[PDB]
Design an enzyme around this catalytic site. Structure first.
Site, short mmCIF file in Angstrom:
data_model
loop_
_atom_site.label_atom_id
_atom_site.label_comp_id
_atom_site.label_asym_id
_atom_site.label_seq_id
_atom_site.Cartn_x
_atom_site.Cartn_y
_atom_site.Cartn_z
N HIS B 225 0.76 -1.20 -0.10
CA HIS B 225 -0.07 0.14 0.02
C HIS B 225 0.85 1.34 -0.04
O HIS B 225 0.73 2.17 -0.76
CB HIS B 225 -1.01 0.03 1.37
CG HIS B 225 -1.99 -1.02 1.36
ND1 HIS B 225 -2.32 -1.52 0.09
CD2 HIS B 225 -2.42 -1.63 2.25
CE1 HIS B 225 -3.46 -2.41 0.35
NE2 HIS B 225 -3.34 -2.78 1.77
N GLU B 229 1.30 3.71 -3.39
CA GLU B 229 0.98 5.23 -3.10
C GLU B 229 2.05 6.13 -3.59
O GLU B 229 2.04 6.88 -4.19
CB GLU B 229 0.47 5.53 -1.71
CG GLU B 229 -0.07 6.87 -1.72
CD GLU B 229 -1.42 7.21 -2.41
OE1 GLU B 229 -2.15 6.02 -2.50
OE2 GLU B 229 -1.76 8.17 -2.95
N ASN B 233 2.52 8.80 -6.98
CA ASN B 233 2.67 10.25 -6.91
C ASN B 233 4.04 10.43 -7.74
O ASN B 233 4.12 11.47 -8.53
CB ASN B 233 3.00 10.58 -5.32
CG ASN B 233 1.71 10.87 -4.83
OD1 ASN B 233 1.03 11.91 -5.01
ND2 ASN B 233 1.24 10.16 -4.05
#
Ligand SMILES: *S(=O)(=O)c1cccc(Oc2ccc(-n3c(=O)[nH]c4c(NCC)cc(F)cc43)cc2)c1
Ligand SMILES: *S(=O)(=O)c1cccc(Oc2ccc(-n3c(=O)[nH]c4c(NCC)cc(F)cc43)cc2)c1
Ligand SMILES: CC(C)c1ccc(COc2ccc(CC(=O)NCCN)cc2Cl)cc1
Ligand SMILES: CC(C)c1ccc(COc2ccc(CC(=O)NCCN)cc2Cl)cc1
EC number: 2.7.11.2
Lengths: 357, 357
Positions: B225, B229, B233
């Site tokens: 996770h 993430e 980005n």
């Protein structure tokens, strides 16, 4: 103390880098600087003297704090003599500069004096986290105050003595050159004591103008202090972690210029430090107990960065190495003094919500 | 509410990663897990329900908080049925697992429900820094509580269904493989929506054993996770900052293993962000107003890192790029749940010392 009480009711007036430049643009501004500083210096002295009295009596009555307090009291008395004197008299202006040099020299030993007080407190009352938090809060503010007072004095005494640089400010500071100056000095020391030193690699990223060497308005001696301190730590770490290696990794520096930040990242491969420990490097109480006495130290280096709204951050990878980033304001209008002020908001600072197995 | 009042007087008991492994070492431990969880889950539910009541009435009476509160109340009532039942009855043990799955699924929509509450508060009362600080404090604790409760439920329902992995824990998690899995997924999305994606470069530094691939005891879905993430980005930033370039810089990852830390640094050349703004990325109130809805988000990613005493830090160079470092405990005995607790130390959190020009 009513004379302290009077000026402590004012708050310091923080100046921008742009405002500093306009104060030293001409030697005719000496009258303006004199009338400004004869009010502002007592304001800044009194505000920090009032904060020193918020310290508990068991700190206040130690010899080192009494000694420093006696210097501030005298320095304040020296200045407030000039409060009624005539700025049109060139004898008043020269006696004022003389008085500023005396005040600066009187306070020259403050850092090791306060350090001796920290050492005493650790042994007379201990080093618990609550004591540490109060020491951090107080010394960060006390030293930033001291930096701001020296800045004002330096700008007056350097400019109105009797011009590219403006006192201690360089309006065209070549950042990579200050990096190399600081590296060269650290290399000289590191070669002397360790018989070895890492090399230096510098790159620049000027995002808006890719070909232009990166310049800024800054106080180059402050930038040197921070870089020198970082280089000293990075070189010693690189050498000591490679006792059994032949090649020393270089120390790398990236200088980047953005719309708001000018950032300087330094990188070493000196073995790193665990995250749980790294903040101890900025603690006054940890830092008290070769290359030891050559620079200002890491706590003060970070205050130099914070003084004009910047910062100095470390981040490490245990087992590999460490990076440091100096963050500076890119615009001279954003570069403004960060000054402590004494009030009730500071008064209450001096006065178990997660689980444990 | 006395049933809440009863269990809220206990504090949660945080478990180590090593303690989790010994709970799933055998399927005979099911009785032990049942008697442990039938006390511990009500303790953790009640502690956070009591904290939810410390919220001001203007927050407490909004529909989203009432909805979430109604779930916790029901989940608590479901569990405390089993308080008098017999662990030697295999019908009690299976009905318990059934009840845990129902409780988990009932709470599945908590994150967008609470996000809707944040959106409402911004428009019904505003987004001032004091409101923001209370939202940060509460949601960090509320979400970490929720992560811990899901962890306990997952470990029971995955293991005692009817072994290398131990429920959601991998005792031999190959960190670089999880990095590649997360990169591959992000690349798949980034290629789809942007018609381009940076490449990946991975290196490892195993300080104590230079040849050994780096393994650890961890929860690989949490690590996925966070990495997913971050990759999302970093890829979007790299593509969007190079609209007019042909070459995309790669994203670089260093995996380092020290005596205490296992650190994962990710690096992009996606243009960076000014220091003054970067912390907004971890603010719940900023984060509410393509790749938008694919991951858990940056605030929650950092909580996953903090859950077993780690951290997730960003540091950027405006005009150049951004680094992220995930810090994890290297030793399974140091990897212990970070749990909020309700008391008077948390009670007072809910209840101008520098100068301005
Ligand atoms: S103590 O043993 O509890 C303790 C706590 C924290 C730190 C230490 O010792 C150090 C000192 C210095 C460093 N260190 C590096 O290895 N590299 C740096 C750099 N590099 C700049 C690129 C800067 C710096 F300020 C300190 C550094 C690590 C551990 C002992
Ligand atoms: S807003 O305009 O006030 C604002 C405040 C803060 C941040 C932003 O927008 C962003 C979003 C994302 C990033 N960003 C990068 O450019 N790179 C990363 C990475 N890289 C991992 C190596 C991680 C990350 F979490 C965010 C990143 C910058 C600015 C707008
Ligand atoms: C030498 C100098 C730098 C120095 C040395 C030592 C210290 C220690 O300062 C402390 C220690 C404890 C407390 C809590 C406290 O007692 N609060 C009041 C409770 N009534 C407040 C302060 Cl300001 C400061 C500065
Ligand atoms: C939707 C959820 C996540 C949410 C939305 C909004 C909020 C806002 O929460 C606030 C706002 C202000 C104050 C100060 C205050 O008034 N103190 C008491 C003064 N008597 C405290 C809290 Cl807990 C929290 C949680």
């Amino acid at each position: 103390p009513k004379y302290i009480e009077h000026f402590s009711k004012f708050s310091p007036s923080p100046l921008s880098m742009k405002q500093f430049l306009d104060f030293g643009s001409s030697n005719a501004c000496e009258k303006t600087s004199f009338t400004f500083l004869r009010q502002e210096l007592p304001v800044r002295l009194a505000n920090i003297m009032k904060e020193i009295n918020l310290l508990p009596d068991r700190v206040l009555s130690t010899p080192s704090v009494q000694l420093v307090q006696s210097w501030y009291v005298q320095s304040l008395l020296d200045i407030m003599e000039f409060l009624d004197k005539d700025p049109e008299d060139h004898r008043t202006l020269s006696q004022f500069t003389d008085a500023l040099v005396t005040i600066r020299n009187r306070h020259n030993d403050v850092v090791p004096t306060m350090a001796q007080g920290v050492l005493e407190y650790k042994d007379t009352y201990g080093d618990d986290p609550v004591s540490n938090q109060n020491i951090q809060y107080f010394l960060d503010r006390f030293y930033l105050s001291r930096i701001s007072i020296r800045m004002l004095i330096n700008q007056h005494t350097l400019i109105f003595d009797g011009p590219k640089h403006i006192g201690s400010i360089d309006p065209n500071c070549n950042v990579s050159e200050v990096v190399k100056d600081a590296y060269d000095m650290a290399k000289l020391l590191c070669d002397k004591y360790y018989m070895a030193s890492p090399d230096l690699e510098i790159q620049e990223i000027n995002a808006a103008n890719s070909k232009q060497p990166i310049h800024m308005v800054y106080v180059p001696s402050h930038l040197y202090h921070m870089l020198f301190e970082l280089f000293k730590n990075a070189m010693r770490a690189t050498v000591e972690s490679h006792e059994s290696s032949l090649i020393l990794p270089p120390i790398k520096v990236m200088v980047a210029l953005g719309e708001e930040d000018l950032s300087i990242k330094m990188s070493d491969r000196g073995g790193g430090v665990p995250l749980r420990k790294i903040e101890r490097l900025f603690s006054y109480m940890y830092s008290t107990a070769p290359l030891a006495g050559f620079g200002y130290g890491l706590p003060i280096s970070r205050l130099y960065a914070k003084y004009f709204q910047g910062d100095l951050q470390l981040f490490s990878m245990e087992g590999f190495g460490t990076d440091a980033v100096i963050y500076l304001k890119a615009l001279s209008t954003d570069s403004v003094e960060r000054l402590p002020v004494y009030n009730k908001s500071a008064w209450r600072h001096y006065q178990g919500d997660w689980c444990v197995p």
